[PDB]
């Protein structure tokens, strides 16, 4: 279940970016997480139509085959919560199936002026079962999104809670970040928890307060440290708001909240459901790798795009000063279209049409053969093509492909390191056999 | 000895830990990419 | 001839796989297969016309250079089989030549309404003996395909069935596969090998005929002797066992090479009806030579990742299609005439088709085909839409699919080079090379 | 700070090109240069508008976060100098900000015949706050560049002079480059440093003022002592030869030349306010990635030029064939009565082939009319196919690679240097294995 | 001064391809070829821009990759070739001012000069001097490098005859072209004209004179007892006309001679700059380095285009009407040959598939089928096959450039005549 995924992920980072010096400490932290995961598991335990249809079926099959995995009232409610907790990866796969189904339904969308303003009508090939079905699967998608966010809150929130408890307690009783020093939004945010009556709700050390107080009881007085560390009756407001804030900080919780928000907004406009097809990227590893390859070299890519913009601005100013009479795109003589009569318009023309031309800006501009400045404009066009299309676009593309290939090679290297060497002992597999 | 660093210049395929001594395009330099 | 190719294939397989512990077992297996090949070999032993012609001759020469290499009835029946099996590669060469000639003649077809609906007829400046040439060439191609299927039945089918019986006996004896467990799920070969045991002639070509006796003696105490005998089964028409025959046909049909040759033959027969199905026979040159086979296999080497990237491109275009359908719809007027305009994104299906078929193939983005936003609203939005679409498709996704196929081709060549170099610096028994000597 | 960046460049150079035999000598030289800068630092111590605005703000943010660079008169003059030299990098950053602001303002320019001949005037969105802003920004940038020139002259130029004197004296007393031998031609420095021997202020920056005496004692036996005395010139306070040598050595410096080019472009920006676009290129010199991209082209300059020459001769060989054999298909006009034959002279056909055919991307046959139902169809088809497969497939890819690979190799060299320093001690070749 | 280049070529060759087991033998052969190399030396507007790029290109080419009746002509042969290249560049530059017109000076080839009437006589004098310098170069080659190659051939023949005894016992004339050609020189009395050992016949007649009859070897090798060595003369002609460099120089001379018939024939001499510089030679040889694989890939592309052409011919015939006029149609796929020509010529170079030219299938049958047809055509041709063809040549050129760097690294890394690295030498 989730413990295997956690183990594989831990190994992935601990070999990709984890040194041998702190590998044992990271392993100990992972075994500390694992025990809490087992406790949680024990707690929850007791024509275009035919071609499009074929293509969608093939795509869904290949995607699914590689990824996407009143006391009695209270007694019923806790069982309901446990039921949602037990099956979460199945609900996340059902939501993905529903999104694909409703997107295939939306693929038959038509717009016409006359009613069935510009109205939108649904085309049915003599099958009236489809229009109510769209609303039905929309309702089920909203319901399963709610179930998924409830399950994530139930089974994954305590993991991040207890990890943050590890981090802050280890910082406190080793370094004393709040007594011997001061911090880093996490430090300012977790700070309110220190004065709470019950800090270690999810951790073993329920008597850590005395340990921290006695550790630095000589540098600071007892009263100096006591103030820092401190249903309706048991409503720990500071602890609960801290838990809500760290829940909000979680990236996967933000993803689930965005999914729920998009599902709710899809009722207002049915075309908002198209954003739910981006979950296939997270389902399969290679699509996630492709998506992350863009941000792997984000700073250098931004610098390269800035250089491209700067050089296009240089060509724009060069053309604006000299080569502007040849920018008449309109064929009609009575009504001209002066694209370089304004600096902003000419810059937009160079950025939008010059880059995508593929053969330089000179393709759109008029031929200078029968006019002066012929050699100057020929040199301008050739140099523009060579400097932009040959150089900068190729550099950006090569950076993207290099980042992608580097990510694949990192994954492969992690796999070979796992299969060629023991995790605990530094000896290789040759010694074993 | 036989194994070579990641981006250190190599001479032929394998003969390093990376085992893949590819060259970037027309570049003469070959490394365990 | 055959033994050298088999040896080269063995070395390629072992070095490419990288297995070291099983190297000795693979060597012994090749040794016994080699003895089987020698025994069976001993058994069978005794104007546009001129330019097009020049180009076809050069292509045929280069393909040839690389990639080409009633008592009285009893003796005749085996003599025919021996002579046919002796020159199987010659038959394949003849088939390739026949297909090349047929395609060269087919390169001179025409259509016309009037007779010599639409009718297909052949024309030639003089050369009235080229249509009968094709008529004869089709018959010779069909005959040579039949000869090829017979030669493959004689050459490799005994080897394949002998190897299958070999691993079956090895699994029965060394592992005790059948008497201690069942293949169960998957294991198509294991499930298909069930009918073999009841056949008395289990080692029809395998050397030892006491394999059943060894299995019964070894596993006759833990498991019942009667059960083992029942599992093991303990006028030529009556003596022939049906189940072994069905196993033989199943193994023969399952073989990839026999399937390819049967497809070749069936295309040869189908060619007589349309006279244009012989074009599929030109793919034989791809399998003939290592280079084109590697080029073809590079496409399927990363098939799963290629499908992932294609699906990502499709869903990415789908979002752009939705955005265009909801917002940028007046710019998709392809018709120049105002009286009769057409909208590519009036419907979602045609909008997606236009975005996928035209936008990806454009090379400059979807913005080239659609009307430019010069003097209309949403100009900045349309510019951003086109720029982002063109980037995300051409620079990233199309580059990455091409990237995967080209990288597969490169590695398939790098692995071949590494295998060739390793065989020059390794002894294949001891881990020493040219350094020692 | 300055010492940290200097050590980064020194270690990068040593790991990249510096040999292991002279690595210790390079370390000693760097320490010699580093100590001299310590006292130097000691003495100075005490709608389209909205989208364009958003894009400019984002670009400025990313480029800034990527690593962008008479008694009373005497006491006041030095105090201003140290104040200026303390924040030279901030002055470079301010100059970059000024250039970016002017260039963004320059985007709001419209040209029309009518006054507000062709008149270049400013058209704003009902905000007249930009018309004097451009002028104030122009003079502010000019003043900033002037102060930057002065600060670079006062701060880093003395280090260059000290280094130059260091190698000059070292060669003079350890190799006899001037009296035992002659540097000869092909070396401008060999003749240029000849003017400094007779100057009494030779060790102005170097701490060894007795180099002349030592080199006189060393070579006093092999060569006549009078020869050494005449060669080194051993016998209000204004000299000419030393000042000329100093001027030559600063003009030789690349950074001073670049700053003077910046200053002269700033002056040229007053003749026309639209000339300030050249100041926008300072971003490339700031961030390492764009500097490496620029150096990629120069890395394979000879190969690039020679490959372009090969492309030119190939296009010439194709143009002569087009001119002699098939030129009736070179009509680019659609009107029958008005021809536009692009192949009637060798020069014009060559220009059409190179300027249009190379950039076509699909061969010269794309623009040329298709020879469907005419003679020479096979010849023309082979001509177009071979032209494409050579020019746009092989040669053009080679020219593109000669820059893309070069950039990639530079990046790989930088990462290799980083890894080598991270996994190997500088002083001793002991790896991280034993040292752990 | 000149033997240095031969030394560089020899050492680069032995490091690049020469094995370690034959390194000593290759050194011996190089030294034997080199001793007499010293004895040979002891016996010895648009106009202005066009001018600007022409001068720049000439400067770059010059900078990188440039008894007494034959005495001064032998040492200056290398400079003579540079002089010929300069003349070729000059005549090529003047060839750029041609024009065609119907008026008198039937299309005519005349000159357009900006008041420079001394251009046609200059071109005539330059052509005459170019053919003269080509004649001088072809004259000097037979006295400069031909003795070296014929001496090498005599060396290899002597080694074969002595150590192996191929001619007397093996006798492989039919198997190879050289074996047949070398049979004539054996009977010649002037076999060791260039070889130092003038008594190579007195050794093999007792090395193999016992098992085999001496009377046969004596007659086979010309042993007997003005000066016209006919058989040696024809052997010399064969080896000199079989030489690659001699053939190239003869081709250059014949092209110069043909340039008098038409000045445009002089454009072929611009390829000499390719062989002059190493990297241009690398670019030229990268195509032939993977020639077999390149031709096989081109053939696979051709058969793929043929399959697409026949598929279109059976089904998509009415979509290939290029002519816009309805009265007069241009049917490009009414014939298989024409459709194949259109697919190979236009479809490959289109860059976006065959469908960018042919008609839109919207509003007609076979719409999705043709959509798939063109999608597959684009993906299989432009995305895959053209990319692979380009990548093969790019990789060949990259590895060819890498080979020289590796040769230099092994030059500066390990002791060539000792086989040990520089780590111990330090
Ligand atoms: N201490 C270790 N314990 C277990 N496996 C280890 C250890 N150190 C390294 N490994 C490697 O981890 C891998 C464990 O198996 P692997 O993850 O490849 O999948 P598996 O055997 O199919 O089963 P599972 O995924 O269920 O563990 C092996 O490659 C093994 O060599
Ligand atoms: N134990 C080994 N068995 C076989 N070959 C070995 C062994 N160790 C090294 N080799 C080398 O591996 C190569 C295999 O030789 P093989 O007979 O298969 O070559 P081939 O491809 O048929 O070519 P050729 O006939 O030109 O030598 C040879 O170069 C041989 O020297
Ligand atoms: N002899 C050496 N002296 C100093 N540093 C060395 C030496 N050998 C290797 N190094 C490495 O050089 C680096 C020292 O540089 P420094 O302490 O300034 O930081 P850095 O690693 O370059 O990174 P950053 O400055 O971004 O923190 C370390 O990575 C260290 O391992
Ligand atoms: N046997 C050898 N003789 C000479 N150099 C050798 C030998 N073996 C290896 N080398 C290497 O060759 C290089 C010497 O260069 P070389 O002998 O070609 O001189 P050169 O290029 O003619 O002279 P110069 O460099 O002075 O212009 C060194 O890197 C040396 O290590
Ligand atoms: C229950 N429990 C643990 O599971 C634990 C621990 N320290 C480490 N671990 C893993 N402590 C103190 C603890 O009480
Ligand atoms: C004064 N001084 C220095 O300042 C100095 C030096 N060596 C290096 N430095 C920096 N020596 C020898 C010296 O005398
Ligand atoms: C006379 N002579 C040579 O001239 C000669 C030679 N080896 C090479 N040469 C050139 N030997 C061995 C020799 O005796």
Numbering used by the authors:
A (entry chain J): 4208 to 4253, 4323 to 4345, 4541 to 4587, 4626 to 4692, 4696 to 4742, 4767 to 4969
B (entry chain B): 1 to 33
C (entry chain G): 4208 to 4253, 4323 to 4345, 4541 to 4587, 4626 to 4743, 4766 to 4968
D (entry chain D): 4208 to 4253, 4323 to 4345, 4541 to 4587, 4626 to 4744, 4769 to 4969
E (entry chain A): 4208 to 4251, 4323 to 4344, 4549 to 4587, 4626 to 4745, 4769 to 4969
Provide the authors' own sentences about this structure as they appear in the paper.
IpCa enters the vestibule of the channel and binds deep at the cytosolic side, adjacent to the transmembrane region. All RyR1 residues involved in binding are located in the cytosolic extensions of the inner S6 helices (S6ext) that line the permeation pathway. Equivalent residues of all four RyR1 subunits make different interactions with IpCa. The most extensive interface includes the side of IpCa that contains the 22–30 loop. At the “bottom” tip of the 22–30 loop in IpCa, Thr26 is located in a small pocket formed by two adjacent S6ext helices from neighboring subunits, making extensive van der Waals interactions and a possible H-bond with Asp4938. For example, Arg23 is conserved in all calcins and forms a likely salt bridge with RyR1 residue Asp4945. Superposition based on the pore-forming domains shows that the S6ext helices move laterally to accommodate IpCa but to different extents. These movements can be described as bending of the S6ext helices with a hinge point near Gly4941. The degree of bending is the largest for chain A (~10°). The one with the largest minimum radius (“exit 1”) is lined by IpCa residues Asp13, Arg23, and Lys30, and RyR1 residues Asp4938, Glu4942, Arg4944, Asp4945, and Glu4948, located within S6ext of different subunits, with a minimum radius of ~2.3 Å.
